[PDB]
């Protein structure tokens, strides 16, 4: 899809592996903010989204946390607390024809900038210091959308670039999509290293005696110490205590 009407698709309830992406697309840029890709194969996420569109080749940078330009003012903008990854691969072999590919356009004139992650597709003619031209174009009153007209001879920075963005939370909300890693039989009453659905720590696991309400997934004592957790396979509630220590 074009930038001014980017498309979003929710992907959840499945086993995601981010090792197959290296295949497709030479991947001129594949970078993440808030996670590092080699470790990305491990954690479990809340809800991962995928947005796809085509933009010019000097604007890829505009898709970044809180960067100003003209591709992230009224076109598409991501938040300042973004977490996730951005991906781009120069595709000048399937989207650029001879004479201008007048198939992808972007809003050049906007009244007010847009909040993160909203897209506007209304076609309206810009104003010119007077009741806006009702269908025509004067000094101003330009058409909101201007075609890119991609051609196969431009400099690389003007050739189009397909881009796709993944964005997901990590507050450990009910895991809906995890990496491949397999399960292991449970051990109780022994100081053991545990990895519960992404939450890593050490301590002794004991059958719990506190009543988790059915919509809850974690338990906390004072000071953010994860005090209890429910098993992601059998749903029995478990208590965590750090193994014995003291001074000598």
């Amino acid at each position: 899809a074009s930038v001014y009407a980017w498309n979003r698709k929710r992907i959840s309830n499945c086993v995601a592996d981010y090792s197959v992406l290296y295949n497709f697309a030479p991947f001129f840029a594949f970078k993440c903010y808030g996670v590092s890709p080699t470790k990305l194969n491990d954690l479990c996420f809340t809800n991962v989204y995928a947005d796809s569109f085509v933009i010019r080749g000097n604007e890829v940078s505009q898709i970044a946390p809180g960067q100003t330009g003209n591709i992230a003012d009224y076109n598409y903008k991501l938040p300042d607390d973004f977490t996730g990854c951005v991906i781009a691969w120069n595709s000048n072999k399937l989207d650029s024809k001879v004479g201008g590919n007048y198939n992808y356009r972007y809003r050049l004139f906007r009244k007010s900038n847009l909040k993160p992650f909203e897209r506007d597709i209304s076609t309206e003619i810009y104003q010119a210091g007077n009741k806006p031209c009702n269908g025509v174009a004067g000094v101003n009153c330009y058409f909101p959308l201007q075609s890119y007209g991609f051609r196969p001879t431009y400099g690389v920075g003007h050739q189009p670039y397909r881009v796709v963005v993944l964005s997901f939370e990590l507050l450990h909300a009910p895991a809906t999509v995890c990496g491949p890693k397999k399960s292991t039989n449970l051990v109780k009453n022994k100081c053991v290293n545990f990895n519960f659905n992404g939450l890593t720590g050490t301590g002794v696991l004991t059958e719990s005696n506190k009543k988790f309400l059915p919509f809850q997934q974690f338990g906390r004592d004072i000071a953010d110490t994860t005090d209890a957790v429910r098993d992601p396979q059998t749903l029995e509630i478990l208590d965590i205590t750090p193994c014995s220590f003291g001074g000598v």
Epitope: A1, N7, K9, K93, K97, V98, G99, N101, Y102, N103
Partner: antibody, heavy 125, light 110 residues
């Protein structure tokens, strides 16, 4: 199931003009990329023009360039092809065909599946 | 820039046929988007294969497309009766003009 019936062709004189109508049935012509295929008598097929779904990308055949305007009536839900300033070498049959991968996540190359019934045009004295 | 498709072929029920379809290094070679259509007399030409190995619905497995470098080649097995029809190899290109066509093949069975 999905039919593409044509209307508006027939005999004509050189110099005049004409209008072709492509009527889509079985699906919505307002969101499916189209393009016409003409076939002269006793030869293969040939590309004519192409409309996008957007409506903002239009690609004509190189010989009919400068003429043979195209548009869509999303009100009457048809396709119209007006042949303007015809010449003698343009006598042929014409087909109105729809591109298959009109979804948004197809991962499959293009292929013209639903064809138009097709009408012939004859331009001479 | 047009595809070169041969005239006609002939064989008896039980045999299998092939047909060559060349092109340049911009339409067939370099994009692998090529397709093949069939035409009985008096009907709009119908798709036989596209995406060479991608055989579409209804089509009898008897057809087998393949693309090597620039040349393309179809292979039809099990000579039946409906074969009486024209066959056109088409391709998606990248300069102006988005589709070119082959001369057309006549497949007749004895």
């Amino acid at each position: 199931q999905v039919q593409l019936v044509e209307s508006g062709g027939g005999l004509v004189k050189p110099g005049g003009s004409l209008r072709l109508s492509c009527a889509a049935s079985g699906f919505m012509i307002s969101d499916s990329y189209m393009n016409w295929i003409r076939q002269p008598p006793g030869k293969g097929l040939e590309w004519v023009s192409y409309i996008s779904s957007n409506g903002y990308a239009i690609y004509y055949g190189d010989s009919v360039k400068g003429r043979f305007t195209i548009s869509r009536d999303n009100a009457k839900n048809f396709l119209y092809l007006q042949m303007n300033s015809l010449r003698v070498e343009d006598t042929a049959v014409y087909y109105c065909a729809r591109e298959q991968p009109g979804g948004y996540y197809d991962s499959s190359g293009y292929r013209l599946d639903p064809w138009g019934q097709g009408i012939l045009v004859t331009v001479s004295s | 820039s047009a595809l070169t498709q041969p005239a006609s072929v002939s064989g008896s029920p039980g045999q299998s046929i092939t047909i060559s379809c060349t092109g340049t290094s911009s339409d067939v070679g370099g994009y692998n988007y090529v397709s093949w259509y069939q035409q009985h007399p008096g009907k709009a030409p119908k798709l036989m294969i596209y995406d060479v190995s991608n055989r579409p619905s209804g089509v009898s497995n008897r057809f087998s497309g393949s693309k090597s470098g620039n040349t393309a080649s179809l292979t039809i097995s099990g000579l039946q009766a409906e074969d009486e029809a024209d066959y056109y190899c088409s391709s998606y290109t990248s300069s102006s003009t988005l589709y070119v066509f082959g001369t057309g093949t006549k497949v007749t069975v004895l």
